[PDB]
Amino acid sequence: NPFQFYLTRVSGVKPKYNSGALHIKDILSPLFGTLVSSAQFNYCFDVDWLVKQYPPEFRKKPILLVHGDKREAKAHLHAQAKPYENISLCQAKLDIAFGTHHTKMMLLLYEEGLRVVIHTSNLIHADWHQKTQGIWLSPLYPRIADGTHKSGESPTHFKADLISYLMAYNAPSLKEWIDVIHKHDLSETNVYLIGSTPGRFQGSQKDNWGHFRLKKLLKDHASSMPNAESWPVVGQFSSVGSLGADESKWLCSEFKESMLTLGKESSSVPLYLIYPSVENVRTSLEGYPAGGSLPYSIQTAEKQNWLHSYFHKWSAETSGRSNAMPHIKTYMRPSPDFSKIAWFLVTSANLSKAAWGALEKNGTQLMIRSYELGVLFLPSAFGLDSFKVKQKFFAGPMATFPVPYDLPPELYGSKDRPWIWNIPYVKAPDTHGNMWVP
Ligand SMILES: O=C(O)CCC(=O)Nc1ccc(C(=O)O)c(C(=O)O)c1
């Protein structure tokens, strides 16, 4: 397959549903390269656990943890890492209120080259145990010979775009990794980088990040088709922000407008949002504790009950993962019969203005609060007009894209409710025999 899109291993499904999945130990294994140094970008870390996932022979190689923690949380992370003299830390600046360092990425420097891993899992045991998570694995990028002058750039501009993303941190530890990336050949990369960084972006910089970055890529590298108005938009996420008092405030006015862009020319497009119901969580492998990683608060939800009519259940029979609650985030553009897709995005970005950006200053400025990162699969980058949807995620022409959940998505039933993590559920027990009392 050309796509190199994987799911994490799930404990408790039959082996056929983990053949072709990846655990963090597989990613860090010497089979993937001889590790010299690594950078772990993430939100939450269990440092003792993390070091144990590296092969024993690699556990004292330098590790950089890139995080967004402040004050006591920052102190707690430093205390976690202090026993390991080989671990350095980089605090990503979050100068806009209510922002988060959400990006999940590994930079893996080998004797043999460099690998980039963009994924959706926190570096804690529970995120790799029984959840649905996504991974994109870059090729092994060879080093450019010293004295040779070449760009090492791909047709998707991934090298420059990744360096640009790292430059936004303004961090000395990441300038070192920028210099590493400069020295490597990333020309084989067939995905486009879509990042979010904190800031207020106008003019030439508006298209660099967030949903304007997506819009720019879809304008430049996808083509509209007849009946494009009938191709739905699907969004799938583990958290929802405050989107406003009705759909016209942000969801259907600027977010959906960017998502439905195709081609360069100048809406009743259906919008499907996939988010676990209470019943999805209750009957999941983890039970109600899976809801600890679905942090939709009642304070937010009661302000936007209009949103929940867009919500569809989590269902993933295609990958054996209906009971493995999603922490992956994906966005895609299927055909009206869900047999093809015009593009697919896997990302850290949830359904929030903080992640995707919101227009300010009379539409002239895009304000983003958080760091996010994902990769976009466009048919044009693979010599194709569209992707056929793979019928079984783990089954056997490799030019079909492995969508990890079922299509068409299924609307909530009248008795279903979105999972809301900070109210109790005491009507029916979960798969471990327990109720949920926050
Ligand atoms: O901020 C909001 O809009 C509501 C609270 C929230 O969403 N918190 C949160 C924090 C970290 C992660 C992560 O895993 O990095 C995630 C996630 O991705 O589920 C969610």
| 64 strand-pairing partners | 39, 88
Resolution expressed in Å: 1.6
Q: Determine the longest span between alpha carbons in the chain, in angstroms.
A: 69
**Which experimental technique did the depositors report for determining this structure?**
X-ray
Fold of the domain built from segment(s) 1-190: Endonuclease; Chain A (3.30.870)
Contact 387, 377 (CB under 8 A): yes
Q: How many whole angstroms separate alpha carbon 316 and alpha carbon 325? A: 10
Query: 361 among the known binding-site residues?
Result: no
Contact 187, 154 (CB under 8 A): yes
Q: In three state form, how does the secondary structure of 300-352 look? A: HHCCCHHHHHHEECCCCHHHCCCCCCECCEEEEEECCCCCEEEEEEEECCCEC
Ligand 1 proximal residues by C-beta, below 6 Å: 43, 100, 102, 122, 238-239, 241, 293, 295, 327, 350, 352
Q: Range(s) for CATH 3.30.870.10 in the chain?
A: 1-190, 191-438
Residue with token string 């867009």: 310
Residue with token string 């937010």: 300
Contact 163, 178 (CB under 8 A): yes
CA of 115 to the centre of ligand 1 (A): 26
Give the dihedral of Cα atoms 291, 314, 224, 265; nearest 10 deg.
-30
Q: Which among 297, 276, 11 is positioned nearest to 131, based on CA atoms?
A: 11
Give break positions in the chain: residue before each, C–N beyond 2.5 Å: 266, 396
Q: Are strands 271-274 and 387-389 parallel, antiparallel or unpaired?
A: unpaired
CA 150 vs. chain centroid, Å, equals 31
If one looks up domain 191-438 in CATH, what number appears? 3.30.870.10
Q: Which among 2, 267, 311, 310 is positioned nearest to 139, based on CA atoms?
A: 2
CA of 141 to the centre of ligand 1 (A): 32
Structural tokens at position 292? 């600890």
- The CB density around residue 118, as the number of other CB atoms within 10 Å, is 25
Q: How many whole angstroms separate alpha carbon 348 and alpha carbon 127? A: 13
Name the phi and psi angles at 4, rounded to 5.
55, 40
CA of 34 to the centre of ligand 1 (A): 33
- Rg over CA atoms, the chain: 21
CA atoms within 13 A on the CB side of 391: 2
Asked whether the bond before 334 is cis by omega within 30 degrees of 0, the reply is: no
Q: Are strands 387-389 and 400-401 parallel, antiparallel or unpaired?
A: parallel
Q: How many whole angstroms separate alpha carbon 44 and alpha carbon 122? A: 6
Name the phi and psi angles at 118, rounded to 5.
-115, 125
Q: How many whole angstroms separate alpha carbon 161 and alpha carbon 159? A: 5
For residue 350, give the ligand 1 atom closest to its CA. 18
Residue with token string 């929802």: 240
Structural tokens at position 342? 């015009």
Buried b (16+ CB within 10 A) or exposed e, 295-319: ebeeebbeebeebbebbbbbbbebb
Give the contacts of 151 (CB within 8 A, at least 6 positions apart): 159, 187
CA of 126 to the centre of ligand 1 (A): 15
Q: In three state form, how does the secondary structure of the chain look? A: CCCCEEEECCECECHHHCECEECHHHHCCHHHCCEEEEEEECCCECHHHHHHHCCHHHCCCCEEEEECCCHHHHHHHHHHHCCCCCEEEEECCCCCCCCCECCCEEEEEECCCEEEEEECCCECHHHHCCCECEEEECCCECECCCCCCCCCCCCCCHHHHHHHHHHCCCCHHHHHHHHHHHCECCCCCCCEEEEECCEEEEHHHHHHCHHHHHHHHHHHHCCCCCCHHHCCEEEECCCECCCCCCCCCCHHHHHHHHHCCCCCCCCCCCEEEECCEHHHHHCCCCCHHHHHHCCCCHHHHCCCHHHHHHEECCCCHHHCCCCCCECCEEEEEECCCCCEEEEEEEECCCECHHHHCEEECCCCEEEECCEEEEEEECHHHHCCCCEEECCCCCCCCCCEECCCCCCCCCECCCCCCECCCCCCECCCCCCCCCCECC
433-to-11, 436, 438 alpha-carbon distances in Å: 19, 10, 16
| 274 strand-pairing partners | 236, 312
In residues, how long is the chain? 438
Q: How many whole angstroms separate alpha carbon 329 and alpha carbon 347? A: 6
Query: 104 among the known binding-site residues?
Result: yes
Residue with token string 């879809």: 218
Q: How many whole angstroms separate alpha carbon 308 and alpha carbon 270? A: 15
Direct distance between the N- and C-terminal alpha carbons of the chain, in angstroms, rounded to an integer:
44
Contact 419, 294 (CB under 8 A): yes
CA atoms within 13 A on the CB side of 29: 8
Residues with catalytic roles? 102, 327
Q: Are strands 87-91 and 63-67 parallel, antiparallel or unpaired?
A: parallel
- The CB density around residue 74, as the number of other CB atoms within 10 Å, is 14
CA 223 vs. chain centroid, Å, equals 24
For residue 297, give the ligand 1 atom closest to its CA. 4
| Packed helices 158-167 and 172-182: angle between N→C axes, nearest 10 degrees | 170
Atom 3 in ligand 1: which residue has the minimum CA distance?
241
